[PDB]
Chain A
Amino acid sequence: DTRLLVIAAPVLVAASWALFNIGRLAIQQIQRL
């Protein structure tokens, strides 16, 4: 099993998920974006 490619894609996911939720979190928070 290529555990690299099985690690490289979630770390794409976990990076793209992370900063985007700072969008989503501060909108459910509603505060001065």
Chain B
Amino acid sequence: SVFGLIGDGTSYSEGAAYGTDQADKLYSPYSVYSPEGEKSLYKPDSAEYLARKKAVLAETKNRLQKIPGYVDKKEWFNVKDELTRYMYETRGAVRSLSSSVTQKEKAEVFFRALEDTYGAATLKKGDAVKASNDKAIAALDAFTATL
């Protein structure tokens, strides 16, 4: 007096079957090995998240001004820390905000000049930190204007 819910995988499914697209019912996931739909609705990525991205580049320049103040008072850890602490957001900003090939090239020049500061901060060479910073900030102030 049962006929328990047999649910072969092709048959009916309430809560326990993993039929990978059956109980999703034309919502059509990304792949069959994932529950979510692909990317079509409810987040336009071109909407106003660009306040936050431009705010990264705004406070990027301010921390980069802090660097030659901490080379004179020879504090090599502060040069390596302030180049990571807030600056972590800059790669996720600049790469996500660069669109054309010209902006990608002015990204590439900015990142090499940013990495030569941290290398020269590791090597503890004060004149190479200040020189690469001038190469850095001028590559930022170029890239901000290319928008």
Complex A–B touching at CB under 8 A? yes
**B92 contacts partner chain A, Cβ-Cβ < 8 Å:** no
**For the complex, what is the distance from the CA of A5 to the CA of B10, rounded to whole Å?**
9
Which size bracket describes the interface of B in this complex?
Answer: under 10
**A4 contacts partner chain B, Cβ-Cβ < 8 Å:** yes
**For the complex, what is the distance from the CA of A4 to the CA of B18, rounded to whole Å?**
12
**For the complex, what is the distance from the CA of A1 to the CA of B20, rounded to whole Å?**
11
**B90 contacts partner chain A, Cβ-Cβ < 8 Å:** no
A-B contact count (CB 8 A): 15
**B19 contacts partner chain A, Cβ-Cβ < 8 Å:** yes
0/1 string, A4-17, CB within 8 A of B gives 1? 11100000000000
Q: Is the CB of A4 within 8 A of B10?
A: no
**B69 contacts partner chain A, Cβ-Cβ < 8 Å:** no
**For the complex, what is the distance from the CA of A1 to the CA of B11, rounded to whole Å?**
9
Kindly provide the distance from the CB of A2 to the nearest chain B CB, expressed in whole angstroms.
5
Chain B residues within an 8 Å CB radius of A5: 9-10, 19-20
**B32 contacts partner chain A, Cβ-Cβ < 8 Å:** yes
The residue in chain B whose Cβ has the minimal distance to the Cβ of A2 is B19
**A6 interface neighbour in B10, B21, B22, B32, Cβ under 8 Å:** B10
Residues of B within 8 A of A (CB): 9-10, 19-22, 32
Residues of A within 8 A of B (CB): 1-2, 4-6
List 9 A-B pairs, Cβ < 8 Å: A1-B10, A2-B10, A2-B19, A2-B20, A2-B22, A4-B20, A4-B32, A5-B10, A5-B19
- Rank and list the top 7 A-B pairs by shortest CB-CB distance, nearest first: A2-B19, A4-B32, A5-B9, A4-B20, A2-B20, A2-B22, A2-B10
